[PDB]
Every structure is written in structure tokens, then in C-alpha cells.
């Protein structure tokens, strides 16, 4: 949250450009992976996922603090740990944006 703000109006250039550059990458580096959680805070209430294997680290973790998961397991994966096992395909794209599109609907109602 530091870097993300500093780079565009805040603290980004009180140093040498290439050196001040290094923090920029860290900002993107932080943006690249951790970016999607910034807002989250605390801990989840649900952990929808697209696959079970490719993210096998989720199930063994998410089902460890109990956060309810929602997994589209291919006919290749292992549903064991997943809460609401949804048969389907991971390896597609028109299918997955349907799933997202499927979840996209009622998530838009929940807000209340």
C-alpha cells in the first residue's frame, strides 16, 4: 500500500532513477501476486476456485481454517477436500467464464 500510492503521486524519485526503479518493480512485484488480496483484510468467508489439482495447495489450506471452497474439478482431479464439488472442466475457457459468469450472477445479488 506504500508503494502503490508513492509511485504516482508520492515517494518514487528522491533517489537515483535506476535505484528508485527497483522499488517500482517491487510495487509491480507486489502488485503482480499479492495485488488481488489488498482489499481483503482479516480472513475469508468463501474461496471459490477453478481447479482442484493445479491449486491443490488451496484445498489442503482452505479446508484447514474451514473457509468454504467451491471447486470445478476436472474429471482428472481429486475432490476429497473440496466442500461443494462441482463436476466440470478446468481446461476450458468458454466454460470457465461461464462458471465465473455463473457465480458472477448471484454474487451480484448478495451484496445487500
Instruction: For residue 64, state whether it binds RNA (rule: CB under 7 A).
Output: yes
Please give the Cα distance from 3 to 54 (Å, whole number).
Answer: 31
Distances (CA, A) of 33 to 30, 37, 79, 84: 6, 9, 26, 26
Instruction: For residue 38, state whether it binds RNA (rule: CB under 7 A).
Output: no
> Which C-beta is closer to RNA: that of 38 or that of 60?
60
What is the total residue count of the chain?
112
Please give the Cα distance from 90 to 21 (Å, whole number).
Answer: 38
Total chain residues near RNA (CB under 7 A): 13
Minimum Å gap between C-beta 40 and RNA is 15
- Residues in touch with RNA (CB under 7 A): 16-18, 22, 25, 29-30, 32, 34, 57, 60-61, 64
Amino acid at each position: 500500500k506504500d508503494l502503490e500510492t508513492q509511485s504516482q503521486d508520492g515517494t518514487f524519485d528522491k533517489l537515483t532513477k535506476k535505484e528508485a526503479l527497483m522499488r517500482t518493480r517491487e510495487l509491480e512485484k507486489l502488485e503482480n501476486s499479492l495485488g488481488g488480496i489488498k482489499d481483503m483484510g482479516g480472513l475469508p468467508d468463501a474461496l471459490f476456485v477453478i481447479d482442484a489439482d493445479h491449486e491443490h495447495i488451496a484445498i489442503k489450506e482452505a479446508n484447514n481454517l474451514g473457509i468454504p471452497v467451491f471447486a470445478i474439478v476436472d474429471t482428472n482431479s481429486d475432490p476429497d477436500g473440496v466442500d461443494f464439488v462441482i463436476p466440470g472442466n478446468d481446461d476450458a475457457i468458454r466454460a470457465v467464464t461461464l462458471y465465473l459468469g455463473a457465480v458472477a450472477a448471484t454474487v451480484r445479488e448478495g451484496r445487500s
